[PDB]
Amino acid sequence: QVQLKESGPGLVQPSQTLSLTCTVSGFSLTNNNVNWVRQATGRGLEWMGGVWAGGATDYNSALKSRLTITRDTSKSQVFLKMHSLQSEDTATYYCARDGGYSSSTLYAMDAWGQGTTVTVSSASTTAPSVYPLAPGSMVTLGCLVKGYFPEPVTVTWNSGSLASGVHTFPAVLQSGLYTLSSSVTVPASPWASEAVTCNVAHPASSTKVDKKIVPR
Amino acid sequence: DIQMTQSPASLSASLGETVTIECRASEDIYNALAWYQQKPGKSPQLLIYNTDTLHTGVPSRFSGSGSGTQYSLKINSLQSEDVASYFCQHYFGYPRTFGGGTKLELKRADAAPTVSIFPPSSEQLASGGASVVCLLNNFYPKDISVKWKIDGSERQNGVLDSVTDQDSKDSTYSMSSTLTLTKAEYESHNSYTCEVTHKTSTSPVVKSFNRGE
Ligand SMILES: [Cl-]
């Protein structure tokens, strides 16, 4: 029944402040420790700091100067506030519990939240432009989902009907904006006797785009 | 503070093999060490604590050992579900510190990439920019290289590549490489080629198209 859940603005501008909340259930903050851990690409896991059962706190050496972790025991909430955010602060943030001496697992972090993605960028929310990738017994086609922000977008082919043989690549950044390619491989037959469409969804901009791939 | 050095940073092993990951603390941590497993796209989970105690539900094929500054995690009879990144962490003093992690992937038979090249769409050129795309799908091992050539001459700049995580079903990888250039640049040349170098061949796999065709 132990559960931790992170929440908060998943998009923050540089130099600005990150404010996240960890809501726990199934245990009390009065006799448990809660830590904040972040995972940024290329930097494995990084312990940020934590707030202990009595309210005491300890922090990562590098982040101490701009990080403050607090809690509200009555609401079962732990808070993270970090200043002077920069690009490298983009990462998935997790809160995790350790029980201390009252637990068989001592100070190891035995329960983790699902994590919350944080992107630190000056870019503005932008819907993608979708371009076709047409060949110019099997055929590979695709669509280029270019210039959107922030992540993520989801791509399906013929509304999931072509689930087999789809490859959607990790997005890459260029001038603050993301671009991703998604490909689908289908029998030479379908390509000639049936329409193939890539359905792109971008939640953040409340947009859905359908691009039919037609022969060149 | 205490530094945690984990090796190897990455590892590929066959199903059924024995994997061994090391973690060295920069100072004696008196067994106050935990190991965490982070399966793909999931949160980290506690695997082992107090050096060798398995957390609830962790299978017996996992074991931890060590003392002083040297610790290790062992997985015997590696199973597909064990593909993940593993991290050690000490809790001897504050601040707590994590090792850099070890990324464990599955070995499988070599597979050559299926390569496809795509010219920019008429629609995108209207914008004044062009993206030429080369796909390299379902290959193994992951190591691969792409070289773009325009009218027979190599183009190094303006290229971005992206590779998928190992496929949970066929254990292969797929990669896309995109060469971006201005419309003027694109329209001033005719032959576009992507050359792919991979262990599976001794000369590059070449795919090309002519703008004028
Ligand atoms: Cl750390």
Domain ranges of chain A: 1-122, 123-215
Per-domain boundaries in chain B: 1-108, 109-211
Resolution for this PDB entry, in angstroms: 1.7
**Domain B109-211: CATH architecture, name and number where available:** Sandwich (2.60)
Question: Would you give the DSSP letter of residue B165?
Answer: P
Asked whether the beta carbons of residue B101 and residue A44 sit closer than 8 angstroms, the reply is: yes
In contact, B4 and B97? CB cutoff 8 Å: yes
Tell me the C-alpha to C-alpha distance, in Å, between residue B61 and each of A122, A192, B13, B78. Answer: 47, 51, 15, 8
Chain A hits for B135, CB-CB cut-off 8 Å, are 140, 142, 167, 181, 183
A 137-196 residues with CB below 8 A of B? 140, 142, 144, 146, 167-172, 174, 179-181, 183, 185
Q: Is A47 exposed, middle or buried (0-12, 13-18, 19+ CB in 10 A)?
A: buried
CB A207 within 8 A of CB A127: yes
Distance, in Å, from the CA atom of B102 to the CA atom of B86, rounded to the nearest integer, reads 5
The three-state secondary structure class of A55 is coil
Nearest to B27 by CA among B74, B85, B95: B95
DSSP string, A86-147: -GGG-EEEEEEEE-GGGSTTTTS--EE---EEEEE-S---B--EEEEE----EEEEEEEEEE
User: Which residues in chain A touch residue B96, judged by CB atoms under 8 angstroms apart?
Assistant: 35, 47, 50, 107
Q: Do A45 and B162 touch (CB under 8 A)?
A: no
Supply B77's token pair: 């009879």
Class of domain B1-108: mainly beta
Measured distance CA(B35)–CA(B99) in Å, rounded: 10
**Phi-psi map region of A154: left, alpha, beta (phi>0 left; psi -120 to 50 alpha):** beta
The fold of A123-215 is Immunoglobulin-like (2.60.40)
The answer to whether A194 and A213 have CB atoms below 8 angstroms apart is no
Q: How far is B162 from chain A (nearest CA, A)?
A: 6
**Phi then psi for A38, rounded to 5 degrees?**
-120, 150
Rounded distance from Cα A54 to ligand 1 centre (Å): 23
Q: Any idea what the Cα angle at residue A173 is, between residues A168 and A179, rounded to 5°?
A: 40
Identical fold for domains A1-122 and A123-215, yes or no, is yes
CA B109 to chain centre: 17
Residues near B85 by beta carbon (within 8 Å), at least 6 away in sequence: A44, B37, B38, B101, B102, B103, B104
Q: What is the experimental method? A: X-ray
List, in order, residues 6 or more apart from B140 with CB less than 8 Å away.
Answer: B108, B109, B110, B111, B171, B172, B173
In this structure, which amino acid lies at residue A16? Q
Interface contact flag, B91 A59, Cβ < 8 Å: no
What six digits make up the tokens of B58? Answer: 């962790």
Q: Which of B142, B134, B132 is closest to B164 using CA atoms? A: B142
- Name residues whose C-beta falls within 8 Å of residue A74's C-beta, 6 or more positions apart in sequence: none
Contact of A24 with A113, CB cutoff 8 Å: no
Question: Is B210 exposed, middle or buried (CB count within 10 Å of its CB: 0-12, 13-18, 19+)?
Answer: exposed
CATH number of A1-122: 2.60.40.10
